[PDB]
Design a protein around this ligand. Structure first.
Ligand SMILES: Nc1nc2c(ncn2[C@@H]2O[C@H](COP(=O)(O)OP(=O)(O)OP(=O)(O)O)[C@@H](O)[C@H]2O)c(=O)[nH]1
Ligand SMILES: [Mg+2]
Ligand SMILES: [Mg+2]
Ligand SMILES: [Mg+2]
Ligand SMILES: [Mg+2]
Ligand SMILES: [Mg+2]
Ligand SMILES: [Mg+2]
Ligand SMILES: [Mg+2]
Ligand SMILES: [Mg+2]
Ligand SMILES: [Mg+2]
Ligand SMILES: [Mg+2]
Ligand SMILES: [Mg+2]
Ligand SMILES: [Mg+2]
Ligand SMILES: [Mg+2]
Ligand SMILES: [Mg+2]
Ligand SMILES: [Mg+2]
Ligand SMILES: [Mg+2]
Ligand SMILES: [Mg+2]
Ligand SMILES: [Mg+2]
Ligand SMILES: [Mg+2]
Ligand SMILES: [Mg+2]
Ligand SMILES: [Mg+2]
Ligand SMILES: [Mg+2]
Ligand SMILES: [Mg+2]
Ligand SMILES: [Mg+2]
Ligand SMILES: [Mg+2]
Ligand SMILES: [Mg+2]
Ligand SMILES: [Mg+2]
Ligand SMILES: [Mg+2]
Ligand SMILES: [Mg+2]
Ligand SMILES: [Mg+2]
Ligand SMILES: [Mg+2]
Ligand SMILES: [Mg+2]
Ligand SMILES: [Mg+2]
Ligand SMILES: [Mg+2]
Ligand SMILES: [Mg+2]
Ligand SMILES: [Mg+2]
Ligand SMILES: [Mg+2]
Ligand SMILES: [Mg+2]
Ligand SMILES: [Mg+2]
Ligand SMILES: [Mg+2]
Ligand SMILES: [Mg+2]
Ligand SMILES: [Mg+2]
Ligand SMILES: [Mg+2]
Ligand SMILES: [Mg+2]
Ligand SMILES: [Mg+2]
Ligand SMILES: [Mg+2]
Lengths: 166, 95, 190, 243, 19, 148, 97, 117
RNA sequence: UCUCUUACUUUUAACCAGUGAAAUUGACCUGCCCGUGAAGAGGCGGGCAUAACACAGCAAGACGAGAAGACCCUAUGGAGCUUUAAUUUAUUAAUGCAAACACCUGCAUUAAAAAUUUCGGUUGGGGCG
RNA sequence: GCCUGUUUACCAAAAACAUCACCUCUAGCAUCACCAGUAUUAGAGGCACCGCCU
RNA sequence: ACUGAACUCCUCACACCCAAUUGGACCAAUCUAUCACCCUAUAGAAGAACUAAUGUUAGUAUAAGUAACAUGAAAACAUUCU
RNA sequence: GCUAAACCUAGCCCCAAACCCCACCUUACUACCAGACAACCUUAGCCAAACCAUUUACAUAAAGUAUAGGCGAUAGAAAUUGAUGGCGCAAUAGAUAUAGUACCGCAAGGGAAAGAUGAAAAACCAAGCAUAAUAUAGCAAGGACUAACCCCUAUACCUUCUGCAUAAUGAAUUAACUAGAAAUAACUUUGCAAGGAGAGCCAAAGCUAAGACCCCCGAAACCAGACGAGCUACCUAAGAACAGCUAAAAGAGCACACCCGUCUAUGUAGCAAAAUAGUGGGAAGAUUUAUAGGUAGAGGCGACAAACCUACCGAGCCUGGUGAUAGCUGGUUGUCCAAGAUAGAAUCUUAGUUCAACUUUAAAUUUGCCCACAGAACCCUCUAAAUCCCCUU
C-alpha cells in the first residue's frame, strides 16, 4: 500500500522573504478503507471540488448518499487540523483544491447462483483524499465569449503558412 | 527399428535385412531377384536367367539397409574362401 | 568438463505428485481441455524438457592430444617468459613473506605454480611457505595440467621436474599404438 | 536416496541380527543352503552342452525349472515334489492360436503308511510319484530320511523327518517297548541317518517356528536384584575377611 | 443422449480470505 | 517440422515401412548370404610386402622364429579372436620383391607365399590355433596376469 | 514489475580459494604417472555414471541396472516408468526415422 | 461427516450415547432389570492420613541448603536396608533378611502391581 | 379462448438510499444506400449523412451469448447390442479312454455359456448400384 | 389397454411393463436359496380377466 | 499533349520484400572458468527468449454501479395496533 | 496517488557416505468373562505391429553377435573378459507441503494458498483507475502540418485454406509459467597415421576426439486393485401412519394427512444442478414411511424404461498401468540475410506414409540451356498448333 498523502503534510518550506507573496496554506487529509464504492465516492468528490469549505459542508449535510457523511467528517477533521497545526487563521477561508476517491483493499466473497454456479463478490472499500488550500475559492473559469472565440479563429487563420514549398 | 534397445541402450539390427541382403564392404548391397523360385514353368529361359542373378541395390535402398543394420555388419571380413571376396572393393571407379 | 556431473533434476508430469484424474470432462464445461493438473501448462505441474537426472559430461581426449596440450602450454610459458627453471625448491625459511617478496623482486606474476618431482620429497620449507599462500600453489610433477598452468601467471619448475616432463611427454611421440592398457606390464615401460 | 544394502539382502541381514542371530549355526546354514529341487515336471537336459541341429555348433544348455505352486493342502500330505503347474498353452498346440491359462493338478490318493521308527500308521494324501519314490527308497522311513527338504516339499514330511531323527538320536525306549531286540534292530537298520539330538531338534523347522523355539528356550524370569546384591556383598565380605 | 456437465465448485478459501 | 500429418506430430511409421505396400526389404526372398557368418573362420592377411616392411623397419626380428606373438608385438597385424579371427594367412602380394630369410609360422599360407619364403632360404609352417590359444598367444601378458 | 527495484547484494567470488586454485590437478595422472590410474578414476559422483556418458534413456537404464536394487520403492517405480516412456519416445517418435 | 472431532458419548444415537463413557472406572455391574449393583470393594477408598500435628507445610523455606540430587537406586536401598543385617549375620534363607521369593500371597504385590498409585 | 380488447389491484417496473453478480469482451474514434468480395459489409469502392453526451423502451442486424453441432461424412478412433462374422473352450455340464481301485487327476469329444477382435476402398456428400 | 397397479429420479405415465385367468416346458427330491417345501409342488417362460369361436 | 509503379534514369548506398522446408551471420538474459569492476570481454554450458493453444495461477477491468437482495405501523422504544 | 510493486530464506532437488503415565481391532483410541476364524493361488491391459487375433523390452567387452520371431513389428543371450559435494531451485520455482493441514467426497480418494521493516518495535515501475468525460469521419495509424482533429493513404493479428477484413478459429487485459530430447551415416575442426584408440573396435587413409542432429496440450477408451446399496432397484428383521362421508369384511367410491407428478403458467446462473402456484392420480393397499442389515460392476437389482446402483450409468466411482494412443484439432517463444511452389507410382490407400519429381546445402567434373540442315509410319483419301533430335550462336 501507499500512504504518500499523509506524508504530504510533513513537508516544511523554507522561510519566505519579506518581499514575497504569502504562500497559501495547504492541508492534506484522507480517510482509508471506507466501506463504500470508489465510483460512488467520486461523484461526491467531484461535487465538492473547487468549493469553499463551508459551501462543501453545506452541500454534503443535505445529500442522501452515505459517502456524504464520511466526506463531511473528513472535511471537518481537515478544517480542525488546518486551524490547529497548519496555522490557518480563519476556518472558513479554506477551499477544496483537490478531492478524489481511490480504490481500497477489497475482500472477495462468493455469491451463490441458481444451478450450483456462483459469482465472486467484492466487498468494496475506497479511500478518500482532500487538499484544503487557504484563501477564497478560485473564481470559476468564465465561458469563452464570442469575441475571444473569434480572436482564436483569426489567430488560427494568421498562423497559416505556405506548406510544402520554399 | 529400435534406435535404443531397452537392455543395452544400443541400436538394433533388423534381421530381415541380414536374411536377404549381402553387404559388400565397398558399400554395395547384393540381393536375389524376387520370384526367382516361383512359377518357373511359365517363365521363359531368358526370364529365368535374369531371375537367377545376384543384383545390386539403389543408392536409397543401400542407405536404408545401412540404417537398418548396425556397424558390425559393415566391418571387414577376411573369410577363408569367400565367393564374394573380390567384390568387396571397387576398382577404377571415378566419382 | 570431463569431471563435470550436473546434479540438476526436475520432476516430469509423471513424477509430480497427484495429477491422475481428469480435472473436468472434455466437453460441456466451456473450459480448455485438460487431462491432469500436473501437466507442464499448469501451475505446479511438471517440466516438459528440464534437466533430467544427474548427467555426466565425461569424454576423453586422446592421450596424445592431452600430452601435446601439456607441451604447448609449456612452450607458451617459455615463449612468453613465464617459465622459470630452478635447481631446487629449497627456501632459506618457511615464511610466506619471503616467498612473496622474492616473487615481487623477480617480477613474477601475481600467481605462481611451483612444481616438484614428487609429493613426498617436497622440501618442508617450501611446503610451509606455500601452505599459507593462496596465489602461490605447490604441486607435484604428476599434477601439472593445462588449466592450472594457464590460471597461474608464472610456472616454476625444477630440473628433475623438467627431465620428468620431457621423458613423459616425449614417450607419447614414438610410442606404439597400445596392445593393452599401459598399466599392464610392457617390455620397456616402467 | 539409495538403501545401503540391496533389498534382496534384507532377509539375510535380519537373519544376522536379532534372535535369528542367536539361532543355532547348523539351522541357519540349513536355511541358507538352496540346493535345487530334483526335476519333477520337466525333463532335465542330458548334458551341459548340446550340438544344436540348426547350425551344428556346440551350445551351452541350462535346465530352467518349471515354477510349481504348492497349495496349502500339500503341506499336510506327502507329494513327491509334485505340485500344481500354473502356466499357459496354445490352443491346438500351434503358437498362431489363442493362448489359454492352464492348471495341471496332480492325482492325489489317500493311502496309509507304517513308520517303523515312529511305530504309527499315518493316513496321508499321496501322489503316485511319492509312492514310486517310497518304493525306490525301500520304505516310508527311508524315503523321509533320504529325501532332502527341497525334494520332500512338505511340512508334514519334514516333521516326520524330525521325529524319526529325534528318535534315532535319543535311542528312545518308547520305540516298541518291552521289545528291546526289535527296537535295536530298527535303530541299527536306520543307523546311518542318526545325527546329534541338538541338530535333530531343529531339523525341519520353519524360520518362525525356530524363532519361537529359541524364545521359549531363552525365556527366563528376571532374577531379583536382591540375589545379585546378596551374592556380591557376600563375595566382597569374604574378600575382606580373607585379606 | 442427455448431456449434463456437473457444476464445478471453486475452493472455499479463495472467497473466505480476510484482511 | 512441416504441417500436420504424421511428420509434424512426430509419429511417422518405422524405418522400412512403405505406407502399406510390401516393403522392399521383405519382398526380396531370403537367401543364405550371411548364414553361419559367426562360425566362418577369418584369417587376417599378411602380405609379403608387409612382412618385408616390418623386417626392414626392425619391428619383426628375422633372426628369431617369427610367429603370431612376434607379429602382434611388432604391430604387423591386429588379431581379434572375439571377431572369429583364427590367425594370420600369408599372402602372395609382394612376393617378387621379398628377399628376407625368416622362419615364420602362420595359420594359413598360399602356395606362392610358401614358394617365396622357401626361395629366400626361409622356412614356413602353418600352425592351427583354437580361439582360446589364439587369444592367449596374441595377448600373452593379460593371460599371465590372469594367473591361470 | 518483474524487475527488482534494488541492486542485488554484491556477489564476491574468491578466485583463489583451495578448490579453484587446485582445480585440474591430477587430470594428467595417467600420462604423467605411468598410467597407474586413469583420469576417469578422479570423477567423484553417482556410481552409475563414473567415467561414462549417455543420453537420458541410457543413463536411466544404467542407473536401474547398477543401483536399481538399492533404490527406494517409489523412486524405482518412477525410474521404470521413465525408462518405458523414453523407450517409446526414442524408438517411435521424432522427425527423422 | 465430522472426522477430526473426538468421538465422545455426546455423539450418536441413544444406544451409542448410553453405551460410551468418559473414562470413569467401573464401580459395579448390571443385573436383570438394568439394576446397578454397586460393589463397595470396587469403590476407591481414599486412605487419608491424620494431618494434626504435621509440621511440613506445602512450601519450603528459601533459607534451606541445596543438596545434590541422588536418585534412589536398588543398590542404594540394598546397602541402606539389607547390607547391615547381611554383614552382621555373616560375621556371626534370605527370607529372614527380607527377600520374598514370590509376590503372591501379599496384599501389595510389586509385580504385577495390584495397588493404586 | 376469440370478434376485440379494456379497467383496476399486487408483484415487477422507473427514481431515491444501502449492498452488489453472470455469461460476454481482439482493438474500436462502433452510421445509411448501392456495388464488390471467402459468394449475405459499420470498417472495402462510389454516393449520402454527420456537434457532444446521457435516461427509458424495441428486438431488424452485430451470420448475437451459450455449449470444440446431437444431424451428415471421415478416423485402418471407441463403445453397447445381435449373430449361421473370425478365433478359442481357459470355465462349467455331460460323456469316452486312461489313472486308481463312486470321488479326484490327465487326455479327447460334444453342448451351454461366454471371451478377444473386426466389420475394405473408389464414390459429384454418404447409401444403393 | 380387461380392470387396481409399475415405469424412463431430471423432456415420453402411455396403447409399454405387470396383472388375476389360461397355456407351454423342466424337475421324483431334503439340512444355507428353491425349502425346513415334495407334481393340487417348485422353477423357467408365453399371453393377458371372464364369454364365444378356431 | 499531359497524368501515371516500388519499371527505368538520376545523387548517394546496396546482403536488407515468396508459404512448408533448407543454409548462414549475429544475439538478449542466466550460471561456470578466467577478465572486468556504474555492466563488461573471451570461451564452456543450458529449465536459454511468448501479441495467441475455449492454455495454468494470480491481479484488475467490461457487462455495471447494472440484474438481484432487504426492514408491517406509531410511540414513552414501557407499549399498543394491523 | 490508490490499487499495488518489488525483496531472501523458509525450505526443497540430485548425489556421496552410512543400513534403519493412561486409552486404543467392540462404534479404535472403550479398565474388568467359555475362544476356535484365521495367510500363500500365473497379473491384466494400454501400447507397437500403422487394424488385430501369435507376438511387443521392464562396470566394460564379447554384442545388438549366436538365437527367437504372424522369421515381422520386434525380442535377445552365454561361454569368455575383468570391476567427497552441486556451471541444482529460491515462494506460480524447489517436495503437494507453512500441510497431507484447510477444503472437497459416504468412502476409497483428491488436495490448496501463503511470508517478506529494522541492530534494536523495551525505537519511481504492470494492468485498472483518479488527477483530467466528450466534438463531424470511420483497424484509429502514417504522410504531414504552424496547428490535436480537420486534408490524402491505409480491408487488426494468429491459425486454417485454392482463396479470410471476412459474418471461419483463438484471444478482456497485465504479471508469471508454458512447448525440438537422439542414434546411423555424413559435414567441419583437431591429434596420430598404414595405422588409430587408455584391452574389446575399426582400418585397401584410416582412426580417435569434439562440434551439429528430431516438441507441448487434448480424447472417447482398455485392464488391475480398492471404495461405494446413509440416494436409488430389490430384499431381510422388527416397527409406525392412514381424518371425515358413502358403503360394507371390497387391490370399493368421494375426500384430509400422506405418496405421486397429468396439464398449464412462472422460473431457466431459478427459491431449486428439476422448484413454485394452480390443476390433477392414488389415498385400507401390489399403499406410504422411520430404523438396522444384505445383494458391487465380466457385477448387483430391475411389475424391461437398456430403469436404477451417491447430482453427469449402453454400464459406477477412486487409484494405478498412464506422460495410454490419437494419420485428428490447437499451440509451437530473439534479430538479420539468402535459396525455395515441380510430373507420378504403391498403399485397408487417397485427412497419412515410402519411393520418385521438385527443393536445400557441400563437393567433383564438364558440358548444360537456346538450337541449322538432315532425320522420326502405314493403317487413313485429307488433315492442327506443335513436339523429339540438333551443330552453330
Ligand atoms: N557429496 C556429499 N558429500 C557429503 C554429504 N554430506 C556430507 N558430505 C561430506 O562429508 C564430509 C564430512 O562431513 P562433515 O560434516 O564435515 O563431517 P562429519 O560429520 O564427520 O561427516 P560424516 O561422517 O559424513 O557425517 C565432507 O567432505 C562433506 O562434504 C552429502 O550429502 N553429499
Ligand atoms: Mg466484480
Ligand atoms: Mg500419474
Ligand atoms: Mg490422458
Ligand atoms: Mg512442483
Ligand atoms: Mg498447426
Ligand atoms: Mg496433411
Ligand atoms: Mg494392402
Ligand atoms: Mg441503486
Ligand atoms: Mg452487401
Ligand atoms: Mg439504450
Ligand atoms: Mg427484452
Ligand atoms: Mg464485424
Ligand atoms: Mg451464435
Ligand atoms: Mg466440432
Ligand atoms: Mg448418428
Ligand atoms: Mg478400430
Ligand atoms: Mg391399463
Ligand atoms: Mg391407474
Ligand atoms: Mg419397482
Ligand atoms: Mg422423465
Ligand atoms: Mg417413479
Ligand atoms: Mg411426465
Ligand atoms: Mg401388455
Ligand atoms: Mg511519377
Ligand atoms: Mg523455455
Ligand atoms: Mg507474458
Ligand atoms: Mg493465453
Ligand atoms: Mg462497477
Ligand atoms: Mg444494461
Ligand atoms: Mg431491480
Ligand atoms: Mg496396433
Ligand atoms: Mg500411430
Ligand atoms: Mg557373461
Ligand atoms: Mg510451492
Ligand atoms: Mg499504471
Ligand atoms: Mg473473426
Ligand atoms: Mg473450423
Ligand atoms: Mg470468443
Ligand atoms: Mg437401504
Ligand atoms: Mg379412511
Ligand atoms: Mg381404493
Ligand atoms: Mg422395451
Ligand atoms: Mg430402446
Ligand atoms: Mg454417479
Ligand atoms: Mg499425445
Ligand atoms: Mg529470396
Amino acid at each position: 500500500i501507499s500512504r504518500k498523502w499523509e506524508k504530504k503534510n510533513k513537508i516544511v518550506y523554507p522561510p519566505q522573504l519579506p518581499g514575497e507573496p504569502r504562500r497559501p496554506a495547504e492541508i492534506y487529509h484522507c480517510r482509508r478503507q471506507i466501506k463504500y464504492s470508489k465510483d460512488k465516492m467520486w461523484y461526491l468528490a467531484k461535487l465538492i471540488r473547487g468549493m469553499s469549505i463551508d459551501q462543501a459542508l453545506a452541500q454534503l449535510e443535505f445529500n442522501d448518499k452515505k459517502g456524504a457523511k464520511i466526506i463531511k467528517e473528513v472535511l471537518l477533521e481537515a478544517q480542525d487540523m488546518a486551524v490547529r497545526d497548519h496555522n490557518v487563521e480563519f476556518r472558513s477561508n479554506l477551499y477544496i483544491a483537490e478531492s478524489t476517491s481511490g480504490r481500497g483493499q477489497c475482500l472477495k466473497r462468493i455469491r451463490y447462483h441458481g444451478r450450483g454456479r456462483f459469482g465472486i463478490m467484492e466487498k468494496v472499500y475506497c479511500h478518500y483524499f482532500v487538499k484544503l488550500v487557504e484563501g477564497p475559492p478560485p473564481p470559476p473559469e468564465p465561458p469563452k465569449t464570442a469575441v475571444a472565440h473569434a480572436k482564436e479563429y483569426i489567430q488560427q487563420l494568421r498562423s497559416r503558412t505556405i506548406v510544402h514549398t520554399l | 527399428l529400435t534406435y535404443f534397445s531397452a537392455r543395452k541402450g544400443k541400436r538394433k539390427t533388423v534381421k530381415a535385412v541380414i536374411d536377404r541382403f549381402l553387404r559388400l564392404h565397398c558399400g554395395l548391397w547384393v540381393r536375389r531377384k524376387a520370384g526367382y523360385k516361383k512359377k518357373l514353368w511359365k517363365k521363359t529361359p531368358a526370364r529365368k536367367k535374369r531371375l537367377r542373378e545376384f543384383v545390386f541395390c539403389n543408392k536409397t535402398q543401400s542407405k536404408l539397409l545401412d540404417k537398418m543394420t548396425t556397424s558390425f555388419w559393415k566391418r571387414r571380413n577376411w573369410y577363408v574362401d569367400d565367393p564374394y571376396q573380390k567384390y568387396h572393393d571397387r576398382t577404377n571407379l571415378k566419382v | 568438463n570431463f569431471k563435470r556431473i550436473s546434479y540438476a533434476k526436475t520432476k516430469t508430469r509423471a513424477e509430480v505428485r497427484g495429477g491422475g484424474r481428469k480435472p473436468w470432462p472434455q466437453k460441456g464445461t466451456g473450459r480448455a481441455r485438460h487431462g491432469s493438473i500436473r501437466s507442464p501448462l499448469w501451475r505446479g505441474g511438471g517440466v516438459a524438457h528440464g534437466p533430467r537426472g544427474p548427467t555426466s559430461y565425461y569424454y576423453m581426449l586422446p592421450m596424445k592430444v592431452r600430452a601435446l596440450g601439456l607441451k604447448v602450454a609449456l612452450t607458451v610459458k617459455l615463449a612468453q617468459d613465464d617459465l622459470h627453471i630452478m635447481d631446487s625448491l629449497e627456501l632459506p625459511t618457511g615464511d610466506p613473506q619471503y616467498l612473496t617478496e622474492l616473487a615481487h623482486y623477480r617480477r613474477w606474476g601475481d600467481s605462481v605454480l611451483l612444481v616438484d618431482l614428487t609429493h613426498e620429497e617436497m622440501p618442508q620449507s617450501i611446503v610451509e611457505a606455500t601452505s599459507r599462500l593462496k596465489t602461490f600453489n605447490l604441486i607435484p610433477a604428476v599434477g601439472l595440467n593445462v588449466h592450472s598452468m594457464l590460471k597461474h601467471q608464472t610456472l616454476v619448475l625444477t630440473l628433475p621436474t623438467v627431465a620428468f616432463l620431457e621423458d613423459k611427454l616425449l614417450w607419447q611421440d614414438s610410442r606404439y599404438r597400445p596392445l593393452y592398457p599401459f598399466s599392464l606390464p610392457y617390455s620397456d615401460f616402467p | 536416496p539409495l538403501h545401503k544394502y540391496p533389498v534382496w539382502l534384507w532377509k539375510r541381514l535380519q537373519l544376522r541380527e536379532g534372535i535369528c542371530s542367536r539361532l543355532p549355526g547348523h539351522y541357519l546354514r540349513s536355511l541358507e543352503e538352496e540346493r535345487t529341487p530334483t526335476p519333477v515336471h520337466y525333463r532335465p537336459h542330458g548334458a551341459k552342452f548340446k550340438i544344436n541341429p540348426k547350425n551344428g555348433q556346440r551350445e551351452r544348455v541350462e535346465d530352467v525349472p518349471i515354477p510349481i505352486y504348492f497349495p496349502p493342502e500339500s503341506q499336510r500330505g506327502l507329494w513327491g515334489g509334485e505340485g500344481w503347474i500354473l502356466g499357459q498353452i496354445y490352443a491346438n498346440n500351434d503358437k498362431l492360436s489363442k493362448r489359454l491359462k492352464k492348471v495341471w493338478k496332480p492325482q492325489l490318493f489317500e493311502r496309509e503308511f507304517y513308520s517303523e521308527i515312529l511305530d504309527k500308521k499315518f493316513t496321508v494324501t499321496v501322489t503316485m510319484r511319492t509312492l514310486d519314490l517310497i518304493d525306490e527308497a525301500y520304505g516310508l522311513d527311508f524315503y523321509i530320511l533320504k529325501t532332502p527338504k527341497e525334494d520332500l516339499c512338505s511340512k508334514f514330511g519334514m516333521d516326520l523327518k524330525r521325529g524319526m531323527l529325534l528318535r534315532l538320536a535319543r535311542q528312545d525306549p518308547q520305540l516298541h517297548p518291552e521289545d528291546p531286540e526289535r527296537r535295536a534292530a530298527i535303530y541299527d537298520k536306520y543307523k546311518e541317518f542318526a545325527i546329534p539330538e541338538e541338530e535333530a531338534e531343529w531339523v525341519g523347522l520353519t524360520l518362525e517356528e525356530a524363532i519361537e523355539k529359541q524364545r521359549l528356550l531363552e525365556e527366563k524370569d528376571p532374577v531379583p536384584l536382591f540375589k545379585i546384591y546378596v551374592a556380591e556383598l557376600i563375595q566382597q565380605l569374604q574378600q575382606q575377611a580373607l585379606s | 443422449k442427455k448431456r449434463f456437465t456437473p457444476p464445478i465448485y471453486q475452493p472455499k478459501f479463495k472467497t473466505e480470505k480476510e484482511f | 517440422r512441416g504441417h500436420k500429418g504424421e511428420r509434424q506430430r512426430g509419429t511417422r511409421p518405422r524405418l522400412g515401412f512403405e505406407g502399406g505396400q510390401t516393403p522392399f526389404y521383405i519382398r526380396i526372398p531370403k537367401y543364405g548370404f550371411n548364414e553361419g557368418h559367426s562360425f566362418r573362420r577369418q584369417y587376417k592377411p599378411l602380405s609379403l610386402n608387409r612382412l618385408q616392411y616390418l623386417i626392414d623397419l626392425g619391428r619383426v626380428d628375422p633372426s628369431q622364429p617369427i610367429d603370431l606373438t612376434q607379429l602382434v608385438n611388432g604391430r604387423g597385424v591386429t588379431i581379434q579372436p572375439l571377431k572369429r579371427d583364427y590367425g594370420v594367412q600369408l599372402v602372395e602380394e609382394g612376393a617378387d620383391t621379398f628377399t628376407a630369410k625368416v622362419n615364420i609360422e602362420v595359420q594359413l599360407a598360399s602356395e606362392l607365399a610358401i614358394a617365396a619364403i622357401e626361395k629366400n632360404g626361409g622356412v614356413v609352417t602353418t600352425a592351427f590355433y583354437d580361439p582360446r590359444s589364439l587369444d592367449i598367444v596374441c595377448k600373452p601378458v593379460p593371460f599371465f596376469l590372469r594367473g591361470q | 514489475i518483474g524487475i527488482r527495484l534494488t541492486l542485488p547484494p554484491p556477489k564476491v567470488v574468491d578466485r583463489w580459494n583451495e578448490k579453484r586454485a587446485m582445480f585440474g590437478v591430477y587430470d594428467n595422472i595417467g600420462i604423467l604417472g605411468n598410467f597407474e590410474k586413469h583420469p576417469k578414476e578422479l570423477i567423484r559422483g553417482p556410481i552409475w555414471l563414473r567415467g561414462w556418458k549417455g543420453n537420458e534413456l541410457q543413463r536411466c537404464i544404467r542407473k536401474r541396472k547398477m543401483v536399481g536394487s538399492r533404490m527406494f520403492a517409489d523412486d524405482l517405480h518412477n525410474l521404470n516408468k521413465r525408462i518405458r516412456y523414453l523407450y517409446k519416445h526414442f524408438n517411435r517418435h521424432g522427425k527423422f526415422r | 461427516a465430522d472426522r477430526m472431532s473426538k468421538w465422545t458419548s455426546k455423539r450418536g444415537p441413544r444406544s451409542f450415547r448410553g453405551r460410551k463413557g468418559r473414562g470413569a472406572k467401573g464401580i459395579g455391574f448390571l443385573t436383570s432389570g438394568w439394576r446397578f449393583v454397586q460393589i463397595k470393594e470396587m469403590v476407591p477408598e481414599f486412605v487419608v492420613p491424620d494431618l494434626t500435628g504435621f509440621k511440613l507445610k506445602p512450601y519450603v523455606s528459601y533459607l534451606a541448603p541445596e543438596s545434590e540430587e541422588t536418585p534412589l537406586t536398588a543398590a542404594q536401598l540394598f546397602s541402606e536396608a539389607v547390607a547391615p543385617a547381611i554383614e552382621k549375620d555373616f560375621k556371626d534363607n534370605l527370607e529372614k533378611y527380607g527377600f520374598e521369593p514370590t509376590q503372591e500371597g501379599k496384599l501389595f504385590q510389586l509385580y504385577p502391581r495390584n495397588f493404586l498409585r
